[PDB]
Design a protein around this ligand. Sequence first.
Ligand SMILES: [Mg+2]
Ligand SMILES: [Mg+2]
Ligand SMILES: [Mg+2]
Ligand SMILES: [Mg+2]
Ligand SMILES: [Mg+2]
Ligand SMILES: [Mg+2]
Ligand SMILES: [Mg+2]
Ligand SMILES: [Mg+2]
Ligand SMILES: [Mg+2]
Ligand SMILES: [Mg+2]
Ligand SMILES: [Mg+2]
Ligand SMILES: [Mg+2]
Ligand SMILES: [Mg+2]
Ligand SMILES: [Mg+2]
Ligand SMILES: [Mg+2]
Ligand SMILES: [Mg+2]
Ligand SMILES: [Mg+2]
Ligand SMILES: [Mg+2]
Ligand SMILES: [Mg+2]
Ligand SMILES: [Mg+2]
Ligand SMILES: [Mg+2]
Ligand SMILES: [Mg+2]
Ligand SMILES: [Mg+2]
Ligand SMILES: [Mg+2]
Ligand SMILES: [Mg+2]
Ligand SMILES: [Mg+2]
Ligand SMILES: [Mg+2]
Ligand SMILES: [Mg+2]
Ligand SMILES: [Mg+2]
Ligand SMILES: [Mg+2]
Ligand SMILES: [Mg+2]
Ligand SMILES: [Mg+2]
Ligand SMILES: [Mg+2]
Ligand SMILES: [Mg+2]
Ligand SMILES: [Mg+2]
Ligand SMILES: [Mg+2]
Ligand SMILES: [Mg+2]
Ligand SMILES: [Mg+2]
Ligand SMILES: [Mg+2]
Ligand SMILES: [Mg+2]
Ligand SMILES: [Mg+2]
Ligand SMILES: [Mg+2]
Ligand SMILES: [Mg+2]
Ligand SMILES: [Mg+2]
Ligand SMILES: [Mg+2]
Ligand SMILES: [Mg+2]
Ligand SMILES: [Mg+2]
Ligand SMILES: [Mg+2]
Ligand SMILES: [Mg+2]
Ligand SMILES: [Mg+2]
Ligand SMILES: [Mg+2]
Ligand SMILES: [Mg+2]
Ligand SMILES: [Mg+2]
Ligand SMILES: [Mg+2]
Ligand SMILES: [Mg+2]
Ligand SMILES: [Mg+2]
Ligand SMILES: [Mg+2]
Ligand SMILES: [Mg+2]
Ligand SMILES: [Mg+2]
Ligand SMILES: [Mg+2]
Ligand SMILES: [Mg+2]
Ligand SMILES: [Mg+2]
Ligand SMILES: [Mg+2]
Ligand SMILES: [Zn+2]
Lengths: 95, 62, 68
Amino acid sequence: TLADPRDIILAPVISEKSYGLLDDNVYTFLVRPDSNKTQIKIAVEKIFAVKVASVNTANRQGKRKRTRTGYGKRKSTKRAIVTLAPGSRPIDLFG
Amino acid sequence: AAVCDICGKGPGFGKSVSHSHRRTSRRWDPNIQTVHAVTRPGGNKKRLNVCTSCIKAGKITR
Amino acid sequence: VSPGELRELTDEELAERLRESKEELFNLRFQMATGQLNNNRRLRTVRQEIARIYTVLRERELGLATGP
RNA sequence: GGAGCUGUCAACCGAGCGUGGAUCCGAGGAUUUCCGAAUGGGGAAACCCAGCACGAGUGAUGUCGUGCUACCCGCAUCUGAAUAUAUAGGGUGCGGGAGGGAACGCGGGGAAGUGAAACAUCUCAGUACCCGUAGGAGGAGAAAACAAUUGUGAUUCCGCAAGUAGUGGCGAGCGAACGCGGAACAGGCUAAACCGCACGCAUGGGUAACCGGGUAGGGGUUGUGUGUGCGGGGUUGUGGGAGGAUAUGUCUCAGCGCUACCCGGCUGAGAGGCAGUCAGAAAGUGUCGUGGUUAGCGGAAGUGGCCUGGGAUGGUCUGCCGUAGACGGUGAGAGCCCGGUACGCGAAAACCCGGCACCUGCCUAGUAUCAAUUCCCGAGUAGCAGCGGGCCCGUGGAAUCCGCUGUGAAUCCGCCGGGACCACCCGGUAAGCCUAAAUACUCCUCGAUGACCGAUAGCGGAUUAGUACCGUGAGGGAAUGGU
RNA sequence: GGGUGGGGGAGUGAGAAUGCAGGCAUGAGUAGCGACAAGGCAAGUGAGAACCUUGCCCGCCGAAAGACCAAGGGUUCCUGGGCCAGGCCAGUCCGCCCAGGGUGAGUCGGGACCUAAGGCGAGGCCGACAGGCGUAGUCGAUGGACAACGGGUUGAUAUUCCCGUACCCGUGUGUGGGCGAGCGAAGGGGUGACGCAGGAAGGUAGCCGUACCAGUCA
RNA sequence: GUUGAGGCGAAUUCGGUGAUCCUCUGCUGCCAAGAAAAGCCUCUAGCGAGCACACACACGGCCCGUACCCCAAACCGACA
Ligand SMILES: [Mg+2]
Ligand SMILES: [Mg+2]
Ligand SMILES: [Mg+2]
Ligand SMILES: [Mg+2]
Ligand SMILES: [Mg+2]
Ligand SMILES: [Mg+2]
Ligand SMILES: [Mg+2]
Ligand SMILES: [Mg+2]
Ligand SMILES: [Mg+2]
Ligand SMILES: [Mg+2]
Ligand SMILES: [Mg+2]
Ligand SMILES: [Mg+2]
Ligand SMILES: [Mg+2]
Ligand SMILES: [Mg+2]
Ligand SMILES: [Mg+2]
Ligand SMILES: [Mg+2]
Ligand SMILES: [Mg+2]
Ligand SMILES: [Mg+2]
Ligand SMILES: [Mg+2]
Ligand SMILES: [Mg+2]
Ligand SMILES: [Mg+2]
Ligand SMILES: [Mg+2]
Ligand SMILES: [Mg+2]
Ligand SMILES: [Mg+2]
Ligand SMILES: [Mg+2]
Ligand SMILES: [Mg+2]
Ligand SMILES: [Mg+2]
Ligand SMILES: [Mg+2]
Ligand SMILES: [Mg+2]
Ligand SMILES: [Mg+2]
Ligand SMILES: [Mg+2]
Ligand SMILES: [Mg+2]
Ligand SMILES: [Mg+2]
Ligand SMILES: [Mg+2]
Ligand SMILES: [Mg+2]
Ligand SMILES: [Mg+2]
Ligand SMILES: [Mg+2]
Ligand SMILES: [Mg+2]
Ligand SMILES: [Mg+2]
Ligand SMILES: [Mg+2]
Ligand SMILES: [Mg+2]
Ligand SMILES: [Mg+2]
Ligand SMILES: [Mg+2]
Ligand SMILES: [Mg+2]
Ligand SMILES: [Mg+2]
Ligand SMILES: [Mg+2]
Ligand SMILES: [Mg+2]
Ligand SMILES: [Mg+2]
Ligand SMILES: [Mg+2]
Ligand SMILES: [Mg+2]
Ligand SMILES: [Mg+2]
Ligand SMILES: [Mg+2]
Ligand SMILES: [Mg+2]
Ligand SMILES: [Mg+2]
Ligand SMILES: [Mg+2]
Ligand SMILES: [Mg+2]
Ligand SMILES: [Mg+2]
Ligand SMILES: [Mg+2]
Ligand SMILES: [Mg+2]
Ligand SMILES: [Mg+2]
Ligand SMILES: [Mg+2]
Ligand SMILES: [Mg+2]
Ligand SMILES: [Mg+2]
Ligand SMILES: [Zn+2]
């Protein structure tokens, strides 16, 4: 019944903006939509054992999509854009 | 007030009937009166609205 | 893991193996996102295992089949 | 259960699982975000913001997890404002309620269009609708009943009685009951009179009592009357208990009503008997069923010849099974190919049902007769008057029943009904409650069925279906099946 | 899947209801193609170009036909594809179709602060029921309070990211010396705190020149 | 200089004019006489053995919106 932060953080965002920020050591994660900056900070800091300078979040509405039975929405998501401390070690994301 | 706080007697519903026998709805309200009732002698009064039937009986005290 | 073979885990290494199941679901999720794992059945399996551990842990403190 | 499987529009892949029993089916549990009666507070429902407690986390604020925190009602306890008694109120702890549901029930409120060829009485119709409120049903129900000279004997429901008696601007219309035939049957619990126990109120000290009755003494004021609680007892209409007398009798033991004797009473326990999950009182634990429901399993008999055909399930010769020739599928009409079918088995557990125990409750002291001197039978009720409602009855001579207003009884040598009323006679016991069955209904689950529909039909909906779309909204609301 | 005959039963016969549904004619290759700003050439792309791309000419708006915010819409934004529907023509284009991507805040606009009108409203009062009203309270901005500027950067965000420089609230750890004051947010009081009209004066932004600077030789 | 992206980068003075902006929640005039609450300040009630203050360092700053359209072809008008 004990909660852990590896379930607040869902997945990394893979995109050209994501890589552009990775270049400057800024990592964008898909996070649980009900989470806030502070638990993202604590969560990243204790998952990857790094010093998080700042977490920036953006709520992103699910794309509405036409299909033969009607219109369906995709998942709504929340990005967390995490910038580490100026000199803290980069996280190893394996790709 | 048309409802007694002791016996719960309420208004009846019937008709006013004219000479032409046109009947329209009206009420027969109970003869509800305000009493300032006490539970024990010299006690604090409590405002009730009770029917004159309960007042005629010993259902309330002053 | 199986419900029977996760019974010999007593009280705390069961939670600790729940922790490593959570961790491996994390990493397997990340390799899903980056496309660097081949067998995608693994996260179904790991999620089921997490559910198994949670279930057994709930029974033990609800009063069923407890013991080291 | 036994070899495939990873649901479906809906193919493609990808990646795997499975006889070490998967997928799948049944049952029980676990998890169960947020909203919603929604209830910590707030809110544009599905969002925001907390407090407390306990944990987690930080260097510490941040942060996370889990519980609890609405209001009202009832019960129990603490406190007891103005103000004293006190109460209102407040604190705490337990319980409960709230909302939803297709129809069916009960109580209450209650139209109009319409019909009357107008229309108001009347009708429509106590319908529609609304309010309250259930339950698996409900309501009713145990005679203040009917009936009429012999009578029936709770209620409900069905068929008659009967479109009758009647009732109606006697118009339009409305419309009983008696009684008969059936379904199903079932009856009970509550005050007093009166009696003990406890509490409160009034009265007296040799006035008197009192200390279970009789016999003697002793104590030497805790009796008597009353209101309130607990019990008994009684619950009836041929009216229904006591209070007395007279006989007759107390299953055993221990304790008690001052003492000794006889008798008797009270409690407890044992023993015996009776009943029970119920309307008549109410809960719990085991054990066992030829039990039933929620999966399922077995289940006969043609590779038959020839013909046509892409295909045989068709034709035609033949062979069989049949407790199975239901139905469906299979490349065209299949009992024999498949699923099955007749039939026969089948349940860990859960739930249901029943039994035995265990348990709980009642009885073990009354009975009979005499006599009718005393008391008892449910109130602001009945009755009466007014105004209404409802009954066939539309107020009429208006009986019975219901509501409000006023007035206002009596307890059986009473009171009510028998269609004004009176007398007689007959019937019944109002103003407390409970009560099975026969009756109503089907959102829903199985199993069947159809001289029902077959895609403009049948549900609005075989298809994104209460969807698209339309409307601010309440609401309205499609079309689209076939290689 | 039918025929015939004995019977049985009908949602049993349509040409009309300004009937209903669907399909399709007639008008008709007709009207119209949505302002009276206005297009053109060269080159390109392409199967296809009046409409797309590029360049250049010409014209139009310029108190908007420009740039923004709120409401509203909802992905229409960007990239890469597409081109039988849509766009009043065509379309290689597109606000269309498809896929992927994209929205970064202590300070901005809101909440976590405040209240107005008004709403709801513990208890409560009233009302046959339903319910009405309302106290405490609690909501409710269109108002009050409250701390950030300039520049850069992406295909798409930027007072949000980055740079430079700030400001506000809170938390912890040290050092120094000082006071054994200090905190007071119940409540009181003050302020908050407010109309309309009209200037004047001092200014500033903006604008027009100009010292100066750099380019051009038609 | 695939004419991307780079690198360098002058001068910036003095006047005029001039606001719908600032001083100004001011001033003047007027009558129709012009929110509230929080906030802030202050008082005391109360709390109080520990405090205030400075500087330095290290930190925490939450939730929602943020794309794009806005005299519109993306809003209300069934329509670009
Ligand atoms: Mg930042
Ligand atoms: Mg944000
Ligand atoms: Mg699309
Ligand atoms: Mg009342
Ligand atoms: Mg009535
Ligand atoms: Mg009428
Ligand atoms: Mg009366
Ligand atoms: Mg299963
Ligand atoms: Mg289950
Ligand atoms: Mg709530
Ligand atoms: Mg609420
Ligand atoms: Mg007092
Ligand atoms: Mg209910
Ligand atoms: Mg009428
Ligand atoms: Mg008429
Ligand atoms: Mg007519
Ligand atoms: Mg009943
Ligand atoms: Mg009969
Ligand atoms: Mg009694
Ligand atoms: Mg079988
Ligand atoms: Mg068989
Ligand atoms: Mg066939
Ligand atoms: Mg068949
Ligand atoms: Mg009367
Ligand atoms: Mg009448
Ligand atoms: Mg009686
Ligand atoms: Mg009775
Ligand atoms: Mg009853
Ligand atoms: Mg019944
Ligand atoms: Mg049935
Ligand atoms: Mg069925
Ligand atoms: Mg249809
Ligand atoms: Mg709409
Ligand atoms: Mg024919
Ligand atoms: Mg025939
Ligand atoms: Mg015929
Ligand atoms: Mg026809
Ligand atoms: Mg026709
Ligand atoms: Mg026609
Ligand atoms: Mg037509
Ligand atoms: Mg013409
Ligand atoms: Mg023309
Ligand atoms: Mg045009
Ligand atoms: Mg050309
Ligand atoms: Mg011009
Ligand atoms: Mg101008
Ligand atoms: Mg675009
Ligand atoms: Mg494009
Ligand atoms: Mg085209
Ligand atoms: Mg076109
Ligand atoms: Mg209330
Ligand atoms: Mg109100
Ligand atoms: Mg208010
Ligand atoms: Mg607010
Ligand atoms: Mg505002
Ligand atoms: Mg932009
Ligand atoms: Mg900075
Ligand atoms: Mg003022
Ligand atoms: Mg000036
Ligand atoms: Mg100037
Ligand atoms: Mg923008
Ligand atoms: Mg439009
Ligand atoms: Mg246009
Ligand atoms: Zn009364």
